Amino acid sequence: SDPTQFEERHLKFLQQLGKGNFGSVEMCRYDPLQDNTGEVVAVKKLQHSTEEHLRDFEREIEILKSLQHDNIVKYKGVCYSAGRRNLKLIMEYLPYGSLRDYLQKHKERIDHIKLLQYTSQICKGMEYLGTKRYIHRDLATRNILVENENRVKIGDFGLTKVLPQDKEYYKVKEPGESPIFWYAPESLTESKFSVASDVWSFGVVLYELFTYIEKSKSPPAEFMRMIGNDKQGQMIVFHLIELLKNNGRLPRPDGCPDEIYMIMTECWNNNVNQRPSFRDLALRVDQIRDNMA
Numbered sequence: 027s028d029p030t031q032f033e034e035r036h037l038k039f040l041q042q043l044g045k046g047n048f049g050s051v052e053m054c055r056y057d058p059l060q061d062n063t064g065e066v067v068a069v070k071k072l073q074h075s076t077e078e079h080l081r082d083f084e085r086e087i088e089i090l091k092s093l094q095h096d097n098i099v100k101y102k103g104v105c106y107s108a109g110r111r112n113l114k115l116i117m118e119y120l121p122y123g124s125l126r127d128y129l130q131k132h133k134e135r136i137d138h139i140k141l142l143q144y145t146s147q148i149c150k151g152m153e154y155l156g157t158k159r160y161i162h163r164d165l166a167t168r169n170i171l172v173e174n175e176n177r178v179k180i181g182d183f184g185l186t187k188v189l190p191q192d193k194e195y196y197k198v199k200e201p202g203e204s205p206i207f208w209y210a211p212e213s214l215t216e217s218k219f220s221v222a223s224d225v226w227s228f229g230v231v232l233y234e235l236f237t238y239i240e241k242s243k244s245p246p247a248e249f250m251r252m253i254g255n256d257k258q259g260q261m262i263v264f265h266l267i268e269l270l271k272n273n274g275r276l277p278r279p280d281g282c283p284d285e286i287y288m289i290m291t292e293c294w295n296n297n298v299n300q301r302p303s304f305r306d307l308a309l310r311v312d313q314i315r316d317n318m319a
């Protein structure tokens with residue numbers, strides 16, 4: 027009767043899709059007729075469903091349910107367990123998988139024009155997210171999905187935070203998961219996240235795309251090279267902070283057009299106020315696409 031309420035006993039496990047950030051995503055068929063004709067869906071669940079994790083996950087579900095945009099993965103519904111009230115998030119299944127894996131596999135057939143189409147789409151998803159005063163915090167190609175050859179979507183919201191009514195940043199007091207090699211300097215030093223730190227991370231995504239996910243050129247590999255591979259644990263963060271303060275940055279990807287490299291470097295401004303807006307990034311990227319087309 028209500029198609030957003032899924033009964034977990036009808037979800038048949040097909041394959042695991044990924045594991046991380048204290049969660050897992052599976053491919054399942056929702057098959058109440060038990061004849062293998064039901065709809066294939068993506069299901070996100072918790073590995074460790076403590077009360078603290080369940081509270082955070084229900085906010086994540088509300089965030090995703092509130093978003094309706096061509097470049098954001100579609101919410102379909104939820105599962106509730108009897109008693110302890112474990113939760114599963116049901117989403118559309120996007121069959122080409124993560125943009126990270128897709129580009130790693132098809133780098134030979136994906137030209138700059140196509141990379142800029144994806145870039146534009148990522149910018150548009152993020153601009154829309156910003157209109158709801160949500161801060162993604164975890165923008166990376168591993169969290170972006172490919173629906174088909176012409177459309178990508180932002181595909182996970184596990185670190186996403188809602189800005190306070192009175193402030194333009196959110197401070198995380200006791201972080202767990204921290205993708206530090208995608209983090210703005212002020213996020214490393216003060217745990218402060220904003221639309222502007224999302225723009226910094228978007229610059230790292232653009233780097234990822236134009237390196238075609240070459241492992242030796244990944245942001246972790248390059249930053250560890252620049253600070254020294256001898257640095258370990260909390261010393262990595264200390265030295266990364268000092269590097270960024272001195273305008274140490276990821277290099278230009280081999281063969282990257284100047285106009286795109288310039289955008290990357292503008293996103294990586296130490297001065298938070300000088301970073302471009304997602305509205306202006308989408309305009310600029312679409313102008314470049316037009317110039318190339």
Ligand SMILES: Fc1cc(-c2cccc3ncc(-c4cnn(C5CCNCC5)c4)nc23)cc(F)c1CN1CCOCC1
Pocket residue numbers: 043044045046047049050051068099117118119120121122123124168169170171181182184
């Ligand atoms: F960020 C993610 C998002 C998803 C995800 C979210 C929502 C819908 C999805 N639809 C399809 C696929 C997907 C992924 N790979 N494939 C391939 C399967 C074999 N055929 C080729 C395509 C399909 N992944 C989907 C899965 C993940 F895993 C991560 C990454 N993290 C996982 C842990 O939680 C945090 C995010």
